Amino acid sequence: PNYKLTYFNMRGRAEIIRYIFAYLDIQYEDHRIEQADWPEIKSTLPFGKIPILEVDGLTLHQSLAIARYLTKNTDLAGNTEMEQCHVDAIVDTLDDFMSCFPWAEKKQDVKEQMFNELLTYNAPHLMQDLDTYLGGREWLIGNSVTWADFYWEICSTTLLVFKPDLLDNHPRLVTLRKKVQAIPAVANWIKRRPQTKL
Amino acid sequence: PNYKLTYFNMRGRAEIIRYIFAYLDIQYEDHRIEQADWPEIKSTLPFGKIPILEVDGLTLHQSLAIARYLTKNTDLAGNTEMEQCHVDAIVDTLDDFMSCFPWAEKKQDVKEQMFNELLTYNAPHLMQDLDTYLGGREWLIGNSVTWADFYWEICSTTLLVFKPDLLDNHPRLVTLRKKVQAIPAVANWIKRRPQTKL
Ligand SMILES: N[C@@H](CCC(=O)N[C@@H](CS)C(=O)NCC(=O)O)C(=O)O
Numbered sequence: 001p002n003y004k005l006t007y008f009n010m011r012g013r014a015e016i017i018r019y020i021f022a023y024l025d026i027q028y029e030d031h032r033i034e035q036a037d038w039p040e041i042k043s044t045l046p047f048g049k050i051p052i053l054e055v056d057g058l059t060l061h062q063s064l065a066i067a068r069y070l071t072k073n074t075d076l077a078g079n080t081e082m083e084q085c086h087v088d089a090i091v092d093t094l095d096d097f098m099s100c101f102p103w104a105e106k107k108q109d110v111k112e113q114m115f116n117e118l119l120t121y122n123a124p125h126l127m128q129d130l131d132t133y134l135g136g137r138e139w140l141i142g143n144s145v146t147w148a149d150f151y152w153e154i155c156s157t158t159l160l161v162f163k164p165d166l167l168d169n170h171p172r173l174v175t176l177r178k179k180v181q182a183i184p185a186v187a188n189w190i191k192r193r194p195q196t197k198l
Numbered sequence: 199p200n201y202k203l204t205y206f207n208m209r210g211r212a213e214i215i216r217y218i219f220a221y222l223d224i225q226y227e228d229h230r231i232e233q234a235d236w237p238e239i240k241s242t243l244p245f246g247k248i249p250i251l252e253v254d255g256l257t258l259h260q261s262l263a264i265a266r267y268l269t270k271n272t273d274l275a276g277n278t279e280m281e282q283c284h285v286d287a288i289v290d291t292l293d294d295f296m297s298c299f300p301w302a303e304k305k306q307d308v309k310e311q312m313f314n315e316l317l318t319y320n321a322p323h324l325m326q327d328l329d330t331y332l333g334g335r336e337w338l339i340g341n342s343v344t345w346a347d348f349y350w351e352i353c354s355t356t357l358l359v360f361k362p363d364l365l366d367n368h369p370r371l372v373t374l375r376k377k378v379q380a381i382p383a384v385a386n387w388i389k390r391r392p393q394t395k396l
């Protein structure tokens with residue numbers, strides 16, 4: 001099929017889809033929009049949010065819903081029904097935290113204060129829960145890479161921009177990130193992608 | 199398998215799971231806890247949050263991850279991969295909205311004001327989006343019921359507690375609520391479930 005991903009010039013919520021496309025060696029158009037053109041585009045969308053993915057003229061929305069669509073019946077999904085459940089739960093746990101940030105807040109002082117709070121007060125507990133959960137496994141779920149591992153590397157990348165010391169007490173989580181980054185198709189993408197703060 | 203669902207005595211985030219069990223005619227234990235027992239149970243949970251589902255002694259977390267797990271390989275999931283993407287996207291859209299509400303706000307005036315704001319601006323906006331997305335079609339996705347329709351009925355039921363006229367201008371969304379409620383397994387459940395505000 002012919003793929004067109006539309007999002008802002010950011011890793012943000014589209015990056016998961018971009019890692020999946022890279023790892024699965026699928027070609028697509030990486031369409032990035034400027035903020036000023038967002039109002040026009042937004043007004044033409046059923047739910048007025050991005051990312052969206054067009055597949056042969058059919059518009060799909062919701063970043064995680066798209067990621068599950070693309071990973072279904074590939075080695076990136078869980079190896080069993082229950083593993084699939086753990087993949088989705090780790091993703092959801094990560095998403096629940098990232099969703100707390102007021103990404104679109106216009107008042108800068110209120111925005112950074114909110115960011116500071118979540119990063120200082122909430123992030124360290126997620127890291128603990130994640131670390132303990134990882135236990136002695138090589139990957140978050142089962143015996144091989146899943147898109148939950150990709151989501152972890154993506155989310156932590158952004159958390160580290162704001163809070164570089166986040167993983168100082170979590171070498172096992174630092175190792176997980178490196179393992180994802182060392183995957184040749186993901187490594188190539190990380191190397192090739194437009195460098196953005198977020 | 200033996201299934202044990204644990205959550206508060208409330209519809210809340212466990213309800214979608216309860217609807218699915220009912221529809222699929224899968225027997226389970228509906229374990230409802232009290233406040234006083236929360237700290238002890240919480241400490242035992244990897245991510246310290248409920249609902250949790252124990253399957254043959256194996257713990258699963260994240261309500262939507264669980265819901266998707268239970269609907270796997272059934273007509274409730276969406277019949278084809280692409281329709282599954284849409285079921286997932288609608289669920290996510292609804293969950294994104296419900297998450298805006300300060301459910302745990304202890305200052306009654308702030309809670310009243312935020313709810314009213316959300317129900318004055320954001321809710322009417324979403325309802326218009328969902329209404330045009332549903333169109334004159336029977337169900338949200340495809341031509342048979344999915345857990346996205348269940349989730350709409352569930353989410354709207356809780357919103358109707360705070361804005362009883364929320365759907366007065368959306369007869370098509372009321373009709374969808376009625377179609378869901380009237381599914382025999384669902385009608386049965388609604389009648390015998392414990393009565394709670396939320
Ligand atoms: N849960 C949704 C969130 C989508 C979302 O809120 N996207 C933001 C950008 S990351 C957006 O469209 N913001 C512009 C706006 O809300 O008008 C998803 O994962 O796709």
Ligand SMILES: N[C@@H](CCC(=O)N[C@@H](CS)C(=O)NCC(=O)O)C(=O)O
Pocket residue numbers: 092096210211240246247248249259260261262
């Ligand atoms: N997104 C998660 C939310 C889990 C969650 O926040 N659970 C709440 C109850 S609705 C909870 O355990 N809060 C009390 C606490 O964290 O101590 C899900 O759908 O399962």
Ligand SMILES: c1ccc(-c2cc(-c3cc[nH]n3)on2)cc1
Pocket residue numbers: 010011012013095098099103104155158198
């Ligand atoms: C999960 C992963 C990433 C993100 C995210 C959202 C944004 C953003 C910035 C301006 N607008 N939106 O940046 N990162 C949100 C959830």
Ligand SMILES: c1ccc(-c2cc(-c3cc[nH]n3)on2)cc1
Pocket residue numbers: 209210211293296297301302352353356396
């Ligand atoms: C979807 C459906 C329902 C809910 C929800 C969460 C709550 C709640 C009340 C006190 N604490 N939490 O009530 N309803 C959230 C998302």
